[PDB]
Design an enzyme around this catalytic site. Structure first.
Site, mmCIF file in Angstrom:
data_model
loop_
_atom_site.group_PDB
_atom_site.id
_atom_site.type_symbol
_atom_site.label_atom_id
_atom_site.label_comp_id
_atom_site.label_asym_id
_atom_site.label_seq_id
_atom_site.Cartn_x
_atom_site.Cartn_y
_atom_site.Cartn_z
ATOM 1 N N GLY C 9 75.832 73.474 8.963
ATOM 2 C CA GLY C 9 76.001 73.259 7.534
ATOM 3 C C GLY C 9 77.443 73.051 7.121
ATOM 4 O O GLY C 9 77.894 73.623 6.116
ATOM 5 N N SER C 11 78.894 70.039 6.466
ATOM 6 C CA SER C 11 79.164 68.803 5.736
ATOM 7 C C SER C 11 79.822 69.058 4.382
ATOM 8 O O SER C 11 80.446 68.149 3.823
ATOM 9 C CB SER C 11 77.867 68.019 5.540
ATOM 10 O OG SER C 11 76.948 68.817 4.820
ATOM 11 N N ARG C 12 79.716 70.271 3.847
ATOM 12 C CA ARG C 12 80.176 70.523 2.488
ATOM 13 C C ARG C 12 80.211 72.022 2.275
ATOM 14 O O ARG C 12 79.729 72.793 3.109
ATOM 15 C CB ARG C 12 79.251 69.858 1.451
ATOM 16 C CG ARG C 12 77.814 70.341 1.520
ATOM 17 C CD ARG C 12 76.838 69.320 0.878
ATOM 18 N NE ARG C 12 75.444 69.587 1.240
ATOM 19 C CZ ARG C 12 74.619 70.340 0.518
ATOM 20 N NH1 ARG C 12 75.046 70.901 -0.607
ATOM 21 N NH2 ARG C 12 73.369 70.540 0.915
ATOM 22 N N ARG C 34 72.028 68.758 7.836
ATOM 23 C CA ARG C 34 70.607 68.427 7.937
ATOM 24 C C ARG C 34 70.367 66.940 7.687
ATOM 25 O O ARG C 34 69.662 66.282 8.458
ATOM 26 C CB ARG C 34 69.774 69.267 6.958
ATOM 27 C CG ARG C 34 68.276 68.941 7.040
ATOM 28 C CD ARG C 34 67.433 69.827 6.139
ATOM 29 N NE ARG C 34 67.577 69.458 4.732
ATOM 30 C CZ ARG C 34 66.739 68.657 4.074
ATOM 31 N NH1 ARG C 34 65.686 68.131 4.689
ATOM 32 N NH2 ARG C 34 66.957 68.381 2.795
ATOM 33 N N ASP C 60 67.567 69.502 11.315
ATOM 34 C CA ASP C 60 67.016 70.630 10.578
ATOM 35 C C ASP C 60 66.915 71.815 11.531
ATOM 36 O O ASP C 60 66.273 71.711 12.584
ATOM 37 C CB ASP C 60 65.644 70.234 10.031
ATOM 38 C CG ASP C 60 65.080 71.237 9.045
ATOM 39 O OD1 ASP C 60 65.235 72.461 9.251
ATOM 40 O OD2 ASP C 60 64.464 70.778 8.057
ATOM 41 N N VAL C 61 67.534 72.946 11.178
ATOM 42 C CA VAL C 61 67.537 74.095 12.081
ATOM 43 C C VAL C 61 66.139 74.660 12.316
ATOM 44 O O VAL C 61 65.948 75.460 13.245
ATOM 45 C CB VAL C 61 68.471 75.220 11.579
ATOM 46 C CG1 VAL C 61 69.913 74.734 11.499
ATOM 47 C CG2 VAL C 61 67.997 75.776 10.223
ATOM 48 N N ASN C 87 76.182 79.001 9.469
ATOM 49 C CA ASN C 87 76.509 78.955 8.053
ATOM 50 C C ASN C 87 75.402 78.344 7.209
ATOM 51 O O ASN C 87 75.184 78.802 6.090
ATOM 52 C CB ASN C 87 77.816 78.177 7.845
ATOM 53 C CG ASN C 87 78.019 77.747 6.402
ATOM 54 O OD1 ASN C 87 78.513 78.519 5.582
ATOM 55 N ND2 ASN C 87 77.630 76.517 6.089
ATOM 56 N N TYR C 153 65.263 85.377 -0.301
ATOM 57 C CA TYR C 153 66.626 85.211 0.210
ATOM 58 C C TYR C 153 67.230 86.533 0.685
ATOM 59 O O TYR C 153 67.955 86.560 1.690
ATOM 60 C CB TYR C 153 67.482 84.582 -0.868
ATOM 61 C CG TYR C 153 68.883 84.224 -0.467
ATOM 62 C CD1 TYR C 153 69.142 83.124 0.346
ATOM 63 C CD2 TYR C 153 69.957 84.950 -0.961
ATOM 64 C CE1 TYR C 153 70.468 82.770 0.672
ATOM 65 C CE2 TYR C 153 71.272 84.605 -0.653
ATOM 66 C CZ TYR C 153 71.519 83.527 0.158
ATOM 67 O OH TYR C 153 72.835 83.212 0.452
#
Ligand SMILES: NC(=O)C1=CN([C@@H]2O[C@H](COP(=O)(O)OP(=O)(O)OC[C@H]3O[C@@H](n4cnc5c(N)ncnc54)[C@H](OP(=O)(O)O)[C@@H]3O)[C@@H](O)[C@H]2O)C=CC1
Ligand SMILES: NC(=O)C1=CN([C@@H]2O[C@H](COP(=O)(O)OP(=O)(O)OC[C@H]3O[C@@H](n4cnc5c(N)ncnc54)[C@H](OP(=O)(O)O)[C@@H]3O)[C@@H](O)[C@H]2O)C=CC1
Lengths: 235, 238, 236, 238
Positions: C9, C11-12, C34, C60-61, C87, C153
């Site tokens: 994760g 990319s941002r 992803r 995708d994990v 992350n 979560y």
């Protein structure tokens, strides 16, 4: 009959603890620092429940006096099966505004009170040869800290460290040692409670006493070294 | 009479919980995945104590089956005042050695089970308008981790997080939500008894009733200000 | 050859900040996303301009077999990873009675299936470097204390803590430390709620989280393992 | 240049902290109770690294003496941006066997030391209008307790509570306040070495720089969102 000492049991949480323990069938020795008539009233209520009771008066900070009183009490009445360390003290203020007395009296009442009350009583408890129960009263502030209470937070956190260490030393004697950490207990505040506490209310003294009474019970024989929070979900 | 469901109550810790709640005066519904005869025995012991009881059979991972069984049960017998999520599963092994089944079955039985059992039961509990009690069974492993138990540690830790979050959501309805985290408990059974002497401050394994008593206390009316808590019953292990 | 770290994760957001700090600390860093391939490639370009080797992996994990095939091929071509930062995460907020099956399942699996699916193919290549290693998971204050509207979560992030601690115990003998970083409220894209609830009176910035991850990945953090380090402005 | 006081920095962990902070670009004031020659050696090392340094001598328990020394020092050299409270003492023994001195000296060195050193320094730190850093050194014993150390466990646990509370009071000043809790650190017989091999997951004692590096991170500008925390550096012990 197994006997339990409850410090600061003339009123408030300590009184509720003493009465619940008496209803559970323990003999209960009441204690107060200066309010003798209140202590006598609690003694009468315990005797009305069919259990033996009397009171002792001492400042937990008077080290040699506490020793003499407790040694004499154990000689006259036998060792305590249980001890509940409930008496504490606050002197709130911003940390750089605290006076020396604000700091010292708050630290010592908890930490010296732990040493002064329990040191004379550990071996008499062990000598009953039937296990035992020690419960200390900390606070949510001893777990998390609180503004204006750097001294009280230190005192109540130090109580936790002492309780966990003593649990390890006394475990082989079948003496459990635990801490109960109350949240905000009823002893525009109701609006703060409504807003900050998940259960939306302050606790009642019996809601704290019930947890102490459970820990003192034979059923709680595998619970030791624990800090049990009674705080309505605050943390 | 307030009724409590105890998952995995055909034997072991769950049976002890079920019998202790019955003795406290609750009606108690027994549950098992497959050991129907032992479930029937616990039901009879609870009935013999003077409380209503019957058993439900389901795998907590079968989401739609669990929903159907619990909705029919609530229709027939009313909402549950309490739910004790005791059924659990281990598949121990070093992390490189764990199979997909070792991992998936341990995680899901705890976390899918939490969702699959509680989702159909929340509204029936709230509709009783008298508060409620939810207790989950974690483990010392879910607090501190344990070698050979990366899967079980994650599963039991995840139960703690779910328990604390649900406590926050249900507090305004006077439903307390707490976790009990046992240490090493004797469920039957020379090496493991010497391992208990060395590692545990109390120098012995716990008994099922020493865990059941803490769950029973939390389900009692007297524990009404205890919520969002993980209570460890572990002989001082941590 | 230079030690290499995978950041899922990255990319941002927080993962990108982590990747850039690890590159500045002198690691080669492999970027992952992803689906936002264009953003992943821009992070790769920045790591390269920073002076380190980088490329990206897309998966995708939760796609267990696809992840295994991609990571196996990547380690075959580029060597084992010395570090892994888990992350990438996912929320689907809502009151527990409101959550759908997808809300629950995707949140639980992205953390806990992701832990298993990414680390299982990488643990042996890491051990076989014979030079220790670093694993860091990203949890949350919610995984420690719970949060309303986040039963899924909180479970997912608390489960990550339990997995992290148990794996730290297993890998300690190989000098691989395994730790968790638990951010509080971080600004990635309300401001008045931050001033009231957080002792520092503000949200955290992504580099304030990345700095802790970078520290844990450093050789100086060799005696820190099995820990959950909270980066939350005093919230708990 | 921001200046940091490190108590007990003539040797051991405190010396390693002082050196790491100087290498990070801070001016560092050394402190010791009595080992004056050791303190001067650390000062010279810090000067050689290119930072300003001098030493202060006091017993952290001597409340008014500490206040006078620190007030004069802030007068001459300005407020401290950071303080690392490395003040601890053990007097091991079974709890009913501890003397009054065993108990009181251990409690006071940590808790009187917190009050005596930090109280004179809080306002000068705030007056810098630059934020700040306070790090206290606790112990794994202050988190979980330790046999033969009821006094030390209470002292080190009290330090944690004081640190968390102070973090809350100073957060609005951008002063972070954190605790570092080392495990077993090599500051060694054959018996100690073997006990490390089995109790600690990393299978060894920590080195002084492994503790100092965590203090140094917390004192850095990059650790600006970390406050109210206890960070354990213990090889996985807990
Ligand atoms: N025993 C210990 O030392 C410790 C136990 N614990 C926890 O306490 C709880 C009980 O411990 P234990 O007494 O060992 O009981 P188990 O964890 O062994 O589970 C036994 C019960 O769970 C039921 N069960 C298992 N899998 C499923 C499933 N997929 N769906 C439905 N029911 C299922 C069994 O049903 P059937 O009878 O049909 O198989 C049985 O009734 C568990 O959550 C466990 O993790 C925690 C710490 C220590
Ligand atoms: N932001 C905050 O305030 C807080 C964040 N955290 C945690 O920190 C971490 C990062 O937070 P944040 O920066 O908000 O970014 P997110 O948690 O939103 O994750 C975003 C990144 O994860 C990737 N990703 C998401 N789902 C998957 C998946 N199923 N498979 C693979 N990659 C996936 C995305 O890839 P793509 O770019 O292709 O979508 C993106 O690169 C998360 O674990 C989060 O839970 C914890 C506390 C606070």
């Amino acid at each position: 009959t197994r006997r339990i000492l409850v410090t600061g049991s003339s009123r408030g949480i300590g009184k509720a603890i003493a009465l619940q323990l008496a209803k559970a069938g323990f003999d209960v020795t009441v204690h107060a620092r200066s309010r003798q008539a209140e202590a006598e009233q609690v003694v009468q209520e315990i005797q009305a429940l069919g259990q033996n009771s009397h009171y002792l008066m001492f400042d937990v900070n008077e080290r040699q006096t506490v020793q003499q009183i407790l040694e004499q009490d154990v000689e006259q009445h036998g060792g305590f099966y249980g001890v509940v360390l409930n008496a504490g003290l606050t002197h709130d203020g911003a940390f750089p505004a605290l006076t020396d007395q604000d700091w010292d009296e708050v630290i010592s009442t908890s930490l010296d009170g732990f040493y002064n009350v329990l040191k004379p009583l550990i071996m008499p408890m062990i000598h009953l040869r039937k296990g035992g129960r020690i419960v200390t009263l900390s606070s949510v502030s001893g777990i998390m800290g609180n503004r204006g209470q750097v001294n009280y937070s230190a005192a109540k956190a130090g109580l936790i460290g002492a309780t966990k260490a003593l649990a390890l030393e006394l475990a082989k004697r079948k003496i459990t040692v635990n801490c109960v950490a109350p949240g905000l207990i009823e002893t525009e505040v109701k609006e703060h409670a409504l807003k900050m506490i998940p259960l939306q209310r302050m606790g009642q003294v019996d809601e704290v006493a019930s947890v102490v009474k459970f820990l003192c019970s034979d059923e709680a024989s595998y619970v030791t070294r624990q800090v049990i929070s009674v705080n309505g979900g605050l943390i």
